[PDB]
Design a protein around this ligand. Structure first.
Ligand SMILES: NC(=O)c1ccc[n+]([C@@H]2O[C@H](COP(=O)([O-])OP(=O)(O)OC[C@H]3O[C@@H](n4cnc5c(N)ncnc54)[C@H](O)[C@@H]3O)[C@@H](O)[C@H]2O)c1
Ligand SMILES: NC(=O)c1ccc[n+]([C@@H]2O[C@H](COP(=O)([O-])OP(=O)(O)OC[C@H]3O[C@@H](n4cnc5c(N)ncnc54)[C@H](O)[C@@H]3O)[C@@H](O)[C@H]2O)c1
Ligand SMILES: NC(=O)c1ccc[n+]([C@@H]2O[C@H](COP(=O)([O-])OP(=O)(O)OC[C@H]3O[C@@H](n4cnc5c(N)ncnc54)[C@H](O)[C@@H]3O)[C@@H](O)[C@H]2O)c1
Ligand SMILES: NC(=O)c1ccc[n+]([C@@H]2O[C@H](COP(=O)([O-])OP(=O)(O)OC[C@H]3O[C@@H](n4cnc5c(N)ncnc54)[C@H](O)[C@@H]3O)[C@@H](O)[C@H]2O)c1
Lengths: 314, 314, 314, 314
């Protein structure tokens, strides 16, 4: 029954993400939007033997037709990192992209769940919320910064070191999605795992800089796309199941938060029919994890304020 | 715990195909090969929280290490069509690519299931077979021209016309993978469907030209990639299920055949632990379908000889 | 003075060709046409400190505006070779592109000089001529297959071997533009040069296979672009100079001919105000060269017929 | 004659720049360097009928061989802007690229003229100087930030508005190559021109944002390439002419300067056999122009410090 729009469907993330959505029985209609190539991408995907009806839309003229009646909107639309850059370096391009696309969402599908993949997530969620406020349809239970890839990485790396099946592993990751703002709560990992402090520090750093590690590995050919398609699909599926009344669906996501000093913050969230059913908070943490939370807050606030400031200028 | 190799893993089909394989609990090891970008694609995929060990390989020296111990090899390696071109127009580039890569398979994983995606399939499978013969390891029950996208398309188009769930539709498609050699056996469709003639003729033509319609829709930006990834993955999973002893696994594929005077031909195949368990043949068809088979034969034989001749000039 | 349209201006040849045209004092108006990116290319070029006014057009709806009042139309529009392919392998894509674009020329600027770059030149010129005939505006003095790169290459290769300045060297090249149809008349080279037959044979083959050499050096990243822009520019400048009344302007070009049994053939042409002033013919040649001409005719006639037959099916 | 190296020769600027350099009688040896595609680009260019010997080099191992014996080195190597970005947003990628490539220059052709195209020029020239200083081979007369495109643009826009031939317009542009630091001295334009203030501010705005204008018009497909190749070629030709003793050659360029409080600044430079013969200074300007200079200092200083501070962390 779910109608899902992918804004930026023709890109590195957008195409495999759209493939995973098309493959799912949770999706009945898939609308694809981009400024280039969408008709070809949609034609391609429309041949797949699943029930989701696929349609491609090209350029701002066809954006309203893409968004009409949407339950979920996922937004990988943006520009990726080159080696050396921070996610923040992308602000001046993606801020405008996110502001433009979310403005269309506020106008044409204000009740949809808005899932922002476009970086820097720490600032693009603040932008999304302010754009919705300006249009008078701000619902903080329906706006999500997709940080799922951090959790997915943490699970993989913990499983590698301990020789576990990654599907059996769950590591809560909190804070935001940039360098030190990525805080993996290894103390809260299921199953219980014990690492020496030096291993834990390297593991923590490995998780924090994993995006940069992939950017380096690609050597100028973009950033994480396939693993991000996986994580984005995972988050959308969790959300859609929750919207269909499945109980106990928990995902971490960068959202409007009162858990800390920061106006936006990522914690585990009980999802449901209203979107965010309950923010489960940070919970019990180690001293090591407590310090990381403290050290990250200054950056998060700066990133939050930057996105808010940007929206003032429009 | 299938070990799967993808040759051409950095390309348009290769990347989404590798994602789908990595996502599957049927795969324990995923080895990726290409002439460029493999390390970045593998790094990307290795972060996904599934059990499959991913490694990327790059350049001639590393190709043997990518292939050793594989149960299945998929080869999308090759150049794609531009609008106007036939798949046959790709021959003079892709013949050498398929010959080289299948020679490496014959040397380093002769017992694997060889799944050729590279076009024109009607000639590249004969190439593959002749290359394996030269190395004295030709097993016709383990070499497959992947025609699965034709069936996937037929299922979707039949489902759309009748208002059915395409998950429940299964259309046998026989012959080859080029224009008029693609013969959808609508008379053998399950569930049985009765179409008025004008719909049946349009349906048949749509299935035959589907690849060209995607090429035209992409306007120079390649051919079907996401739906081909889906179809390739489906075929590998069918192969793996059969290898694990699942009974009644049937797929159409362009293989060594005695069904017609064409030495290679696509029919439904019962798959087993050693590849093709039993060629189920053409079966009973309509007069319309019989005519299409007769009309397909001259082209198929020409594409076959073309592939064979190429190997004899080396 | 001259108004020049470039059809396929966003491509590998198109962009640098357009750069060289924009840089020229012979050009006062430069219209650029493609199916993508033309606006950005024109904006780029419009900033250059020369008099030529640049305008970019996008899509068939805008093709008449681009063509109106043109003195010369250059057509690099098409698709390039990958390693292994012949120029003839491009036929099925480029035949339709050339037929479509030259039909628009016939309608909107029938008086213009039509310079065809798109391959295979041995077929695309016949196609161009037949399209103009169907519109009833055929002028054999104004339709040119651009072979100029063959002359340029011959000049360079002869100059390297004799330690000469390639600017001082002129080698007539006749026949067509593919494989052994490329016939460099080394016996007519100015300055006079002597090679023993073994060197001459090697030099001749190098000139013939030079296009394939570049395709293979680019390893899938296209064919000759920059040197073709140079050759394309040179031919257009010769044509405009001749149109401005300059005397003794001679260029080889594949055109409607009666110098052989081939209805199209490349020989040195004296250019004038109305296009071809006089075909200077083959002239006196060696037995080596005479033999090459005789052996080339069957391929040329087959390529010519193929182009003619294509237009008959429109 | 001049031995010129192009570092980043396979890119959007690099290829047509190399074409222009190959076409010139001033160049005797053209060495092309990149991390990809150079052998194909060199093959392509080597067929052009001019005397310049063209060689391609690939990967940091061959970089010393590309630089040895060079008189001039031009460096477009780097990443370009996407719409919305400033040139400074490129710093965290391009800084390391320039530092690496200029370190190789300092090691292998310390006596050569170094022309940096890579952005942001306001920081990358300071990086080049400090890198040369670290190797003890700093010569401020030989290091040039290519701002030439600003002058070319100014000339075109002035000529447009005043119905002049842009080839005989000369507008000095001073300061730097980023937004408000681009300061066109319309008061010093030859021939003399006068605009109403509202027009002059519009003209000045146009020149300053001209780079963004092209970036936006290309809509994600890169930045100015063809006009930059023209501008880079012009500057190299001016520089090579002056090295051959041609007199009266003047170009604006971002260089080590003491005309203002900024350590680096762009002013008209008389070029000579040793590089900079004389810095011709800012000269007499209007109060409008003086205000802009004053407004630009803080930004210029910041960009300079950024570049300097980067090299101090190596
Ligand atoms: N949330 C995460 O953990 C996470 C992970 C990976 C990547 N990302 C971010 O996702 C974004 C997309 O990355 P990618 O690899 O797909 O880049 P990409 O360039 O491959 O694809 C981006 C797509 O966005 C489209 N687009 C750009 N502007 C648009 C517009 N104004 N309207 C419609 N479409 C537009 C482009 O045309 C392109 O098709 C980047 O900002 C990247 O940093 C986030
Ligand atoms: N079986 C089918 O029905 C079917 C379906 C779709 C596409 N195809 C064919 O699949 C092929 C690839 O299509 P695509 O869309 O992925 O094209 P693509 O250009 O996106 O990718 C092709 C990949 O092949 C790789 N490659 C080329 N030569 C190689 C070599 N020698 N060794 C290793 N890798 C090499 C390239 O690096 C590239 O990554 C084409 O020939 C296309 O026609 C077949
Ligand atoms: N005459 C010669 O000796 C000679 C020399 C070199 C190349 N060529 C031929 O020139 C052609 C172009 O080569 P390239 O390297 O520029 O290829 P390219 O792909 O880089 O560029 C071709 C351009 O043509 C455009 N195009 C395609 N279809 C079009 C259409 N229908 N309408 C308008 N534009 C269209 C494309 O969009 C692209 O911008 C090739 O066929 C090549 O074989 C001929
Ligand atoms: N000086 C100016 O006024 C001016 C004007 C235009 C563009 N630029 C800058 O020029 C740079 C290149 O622009 P472009 O449009 O050609 O971009 P492009 O991406 O088309 O070209 C990039 C080229 O640099 C190469 N490269 C990247 N890293 C390299 C390395 N480490 N070593 C060798 N080569 C490397 C790439 O392989 C590619 O060939 C950009 O930074 C752009 O902002 C400056």
């Amino acid at each position: 029954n779910a109608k899902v729009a992918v804004l930026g469907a023709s890109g590195g993330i957008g195409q495999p993400l759209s493939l995973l959505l098309k493959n799912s029985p949770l999706v009945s209609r898939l609308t694809l939007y981009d400024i280039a190539h969408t008709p070809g991408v949609a034609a391609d995907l429309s041949h797949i033997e699943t029930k989701a009806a696929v349609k491609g839309y090209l350029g701002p003229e066809q954006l309203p037709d893409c968004l009409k009646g949407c339950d979920v909107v996922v937004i990988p639309a943006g520009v990726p990192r080159k080696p050396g850059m921070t996610r923040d370096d992308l602000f001046n391009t993606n801020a405008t992209i996110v502001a433009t696309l979310t403005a269309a969402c506020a106008q044409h599908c204000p009740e949809a769940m808005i899932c922002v993949i476009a970086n820097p997530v720490n600032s693009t969620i603040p932008i999304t919320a302010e754009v919705f406020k300006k249009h008078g349809v701000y619902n903080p239970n329906k706006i999500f910064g997709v940080t799922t890839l951090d959790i997915v990485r943490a699970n993989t790396f913990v499983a590698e070191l301990k020789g576990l099946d990654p599907a059996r592993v769950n590591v809560p990751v909190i804070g935001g999605h940039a360098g030190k703002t990525i805080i993996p709560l290894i103390s809260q990992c299921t199953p219980k795992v014990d690492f020496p402090q030096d291993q834990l520090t390297a593991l923590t750093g490995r998780i924090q800089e994993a995006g940069t590690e992939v950017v380096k590995a690609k050597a100028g050919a973009g950033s994480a796309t396939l693993s991000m398609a996986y994580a984005g699909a995972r988050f959308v599926f969790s959300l859609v199941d929750a919207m269909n009344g499945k109980e106990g669906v928990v995902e971490c996501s960068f959202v409007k938060s009162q858990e800390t000093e920061c106006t936006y913050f990522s914690t585990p969230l009980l999802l449901g029919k209203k979107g965010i059913e309950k923010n489960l908070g940070i919970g019990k943490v180690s001293s090591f994890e407590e310090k990381m939370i403290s050290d990250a807050i200054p950056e998060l606030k700066a990133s939050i304020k930057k996105g808010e400031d940007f929206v003032k200028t429009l």
